[PDB]
Design a protein around this nucleic acid. Structure first.
Ligand SMILES: [Mg+2]
Length: 437
DNA sequence: GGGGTGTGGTAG
DNA sequence: ATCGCTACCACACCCC
């Protein structure tokens, strides 16, 4: 048990944190892509007609945790039993759940406590531990398999278990549904074999946005092919409003108030006008939804196809620790900030780049929130405070950055005992070049 | 036309 | 117990 004033805390937290793991795995895939395309111009161009194959493991952690489960769980049955992956028994996040679990209304991000109430009497919830290293090995087999198929002109990592795979179509070839259905089936069988039993679903279209919706429609363990040509009312009626890219709970809520609670993308499509939509959720998001409702990608999302090296290139660097934060005095806060800065500078020197602007953000207990929140070591209900600082010269010097970071903390005025969360960010990065005179 | 900062949504 | 990250965009509002 590692307290936040222990020099080992960051290492233990990050080793246990599935969200940290997902972020680092994602950054590593993006750097790997860059280091492999330092010479290629494998880009998509305006002259290219292309098909999108958007691929994603089904209930990834739960599948892998099951395939690699310990002998204590030998008798657990992935097709019969409700299965979650999590650390604990109560206010512990469900990181993944199998489709047995989901059939009872369990969803990712639920606490185990809430999930247990959703089961009928007599049905027991199976809780598997994380298998982080094997999560990564299955991801290697995934990406290895996609490259070996030699059917994609461009392979874009979205995450450890999800990729957007681009196939250029010569106008010498006439596109058909049967041919894309056969590719989908090959991809699914080769990944199933290559990962020793994980399954993927696949959305296939002539736009990124349709391919992502088709993928949602295709789950679980299936595929769906919906081109712009094939759009119909049954397609749009299949999706909730927050299935759209960039529509979360907050945008969802605004769309409902504005348009009298549409219950499907079809309802939204029939009621909206671009004007009122921009007024509801903003000019850029509104245009994006409007484009999305015609099955069309926006200019921003298309850049990943025409310039993936620039899209995937890292523009900032940060850590966020909003769990386990309980400090008694300012001395312990300063030491934790120094540790965070050290960690971040190891990451910064890995990619050979200086930083010109830093930010400290923190979470502070709401004046009326309990000192000890419902979730053990959780941040609870908090107010956010943030402040940034331009560095004179771009630097990687600990003495400069750490001092400024500790200074930033003092400017935000948070008493150490009220602190519940800390983010440390390098907001602008400058390349290091061969001439340093 | 350019530049800025803090806050906050979303993704996956 | 329990591991509530992190990159990126968009906004409201401010300066010249
Ligand atoms: Mg959404």
């Amino acid at each position: 048990i590692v307290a936040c004033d222990d020099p080992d805390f960051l290492t233990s937290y990050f080793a246990h944190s599935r969200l940290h793991h997902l972020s680092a795995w994602k950054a590593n895939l993006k750097d790997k892509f860059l280091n492999e395309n330092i010479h290629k111009y494998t880009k998509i161009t305006d002259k290219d007609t292309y098909i999108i194959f958007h691929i994603d493991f089904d209930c990834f952690f739960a599948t892998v945790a099951y395939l690699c489960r310990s002998s204590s769980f030998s008798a657990c049955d992935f097709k019969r039993d409700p299965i979650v992956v999590c650390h604990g028994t109560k206010n512990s996040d469900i990181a993944s759940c199998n489709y047995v679990a989901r059939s009872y209304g369990i969803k990712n991000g639920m606490w185990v406590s809430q999930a247990e109430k959703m089961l009928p009497n007599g049905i027991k919830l199976i809780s598997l531990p994380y298998t982080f290293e094997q999560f990564q090995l299955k991801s290697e087999a995934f990406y290895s398999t996609l490259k070996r198929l030699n059917i994609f002109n461009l392979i874009l990592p979205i995450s450890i278990d999800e990729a957007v795979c681009v196939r250029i179509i010569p106008d010498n070839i006439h596109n058909t549904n049967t041919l894309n259905a056969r590719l989908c089936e090959e991809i699914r069988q080769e990944i199933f074999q290559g990962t020793n039993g994980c399954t993927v679903s696949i959305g296939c279209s002539d736009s990124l946005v349709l391919a992502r919706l088709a993928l949602k429609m295709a789950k679980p363990n299936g595929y769906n092919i919906t081109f712009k040509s094939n759009l119909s009312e049954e397609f749009w009626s299949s999706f909730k409003l927050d299935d759209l890219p960039g529509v979360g709970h907050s945008t969802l809520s605004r769309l409902e108030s504005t348009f009298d609670s549409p219950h499907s993308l079809n309802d939204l499509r029939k009621r909206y006008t671009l004007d009122a939509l921009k007024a509801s959720v903003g000019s850029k998001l509104g245009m994006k939804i409007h484009l999305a409702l015609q099955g069309q990608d926006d200019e921003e999302s298309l850049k990943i196809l025409y310039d993936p090296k620039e899209v995937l290139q890292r523009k900032s660097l940060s850590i966020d620790i909003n769990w386990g934060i309980r400090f008694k005095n300012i001395t312990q806060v300063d030491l934790f900030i120094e540790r965070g800065c050290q960690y971040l500078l190891e990451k910064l020197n890995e990619i050979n780049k200086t930083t010109s602007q830093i930010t400290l953000k923190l979470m502070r207990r709401c004046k009326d929130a309990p000192i000890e929140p419902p979730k053990y070591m959780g941040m609870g209900r908090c107010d956010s405070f943030s402040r940034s600082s331009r560095l004179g010269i771009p630097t990687n010097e600990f003495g400069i950055i750490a001092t400024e970071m500790k200074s930033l903390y003092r400017t935000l005025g948070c008493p150490p005992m009220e602190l519940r969360g800390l983010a440390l960010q390098f907001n602008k990065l400058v390349d290091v070049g061969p001439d340093n005179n």
